[PDB]
Amino acid sequence: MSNISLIVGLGNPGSEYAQTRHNAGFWFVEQLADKYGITLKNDPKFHGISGRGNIEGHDVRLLLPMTYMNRSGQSVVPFSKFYQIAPEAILIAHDELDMNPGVIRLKTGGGHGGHNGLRDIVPHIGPNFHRLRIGIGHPGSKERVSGHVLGKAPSNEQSLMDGAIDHALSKVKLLVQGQVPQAMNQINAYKPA
Amino acid sequence: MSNISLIVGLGNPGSEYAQTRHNAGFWFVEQLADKYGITLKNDPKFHGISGRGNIEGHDVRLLLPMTYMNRSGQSVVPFSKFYQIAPEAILIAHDELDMNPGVIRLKTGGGHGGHNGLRDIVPHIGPNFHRLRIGIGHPGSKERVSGHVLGKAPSNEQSLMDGAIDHALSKVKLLVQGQVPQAMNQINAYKPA
């Protein structure tokens, strides 16, 4: 329904990618799973890692595609179809070039904005899912983007992103209770202390 | 039996990885394919891009896994099984952290040496295939490895690697004509300085 029932984290599998900026979505959903004591388990049928449990009085599914970023739809699409989860009840957390470290915003609908993980999802389920856009900064040219997203942020930038993620984690109650405009106001207002 | 009939290049799919050090094996096989006018085509059955043609009077197959590096066995294994090509007839080109840019060596057997592409192949076909080890240099600590292999080499290092690949290319006649010891002597003698 209006309630967010499925929270997806985008990123790449394996310890060599775990700390890279392109894994911002993974950071959010891994931290959310442990905050609520939801176990993320290997889910090879849906080419991901997935979990289910109570978040703030609602039964919520958590998914990390293990397809690699540009093939995320190979996990998200059959998973959401098998469980008959409408896009409107999906939140996809991802790295956002177009926002700085320590900026974080909740968006509903629109396109992929050149994000190759969203590019593999929008065609299949349509655009009407929610996104948690975790700012990672833009390095200032197209050519520098790959090294940036596949790079580890320096600690001052990582702390800015970690603070924005912590803030967003504290608003998931509004999202799973279906209070999306209140979640949007409260997430988007975030500024580093 | 001693003739190389299958040449594999290891690497990651997509333009964002094409110039990264981890794609050294792709560089070698792409350059080999165009040297001999061998078209590399989509081969979804074997989760790769593949070609076939005449190299120096021999029918040789070329394979670029499109699995991502750590899943290269998902292509190499079923491909080698389907064409019934034994390990001793396989040459796998890959990036080598433990050799400097401009160093290039042909090796027969042994293990993966922590290369996560070889790690996904050795368990299934065993160790008795040949390897073209393309030096890419070592960034000097385990934590720096991922940024190094998923990074684009500076022009000076790229020139060294390119000259080594060019030299290896000059020796493929010996490999496909079943003169492996001669190819190993002549490849491993390459001096980038």
TrEMBL record, chains A, B:
Biological process per Gene Ontology, one example term: rescue of stalled ribosome
Binding site for tRNA: 17, 68, 70, 116
Gene3D superfamilies noted in UniProt: Peptidyl-tRNA hydrolase (3.40.50.1470)
CDD domains for the chain: PTH
EC number(s) given by UniProt: 3.1.1.29
Residues with site note (Stabilizes the basic form of H active site to accept a proton): 95
Subunit composition and interactions: Monomer.
Name listed for the protein in its UniProt record: Peptidyl-tRNA hydrolase
Species this chain originates from: Acinetobacter baumannii (strain ATCC 19606 / DSM 30007 / JCM 6841 / CCUG 19606 / CIP 70.34 / NBRC 109757 / NCIMB 12457 / NCTC 12156 / 81)
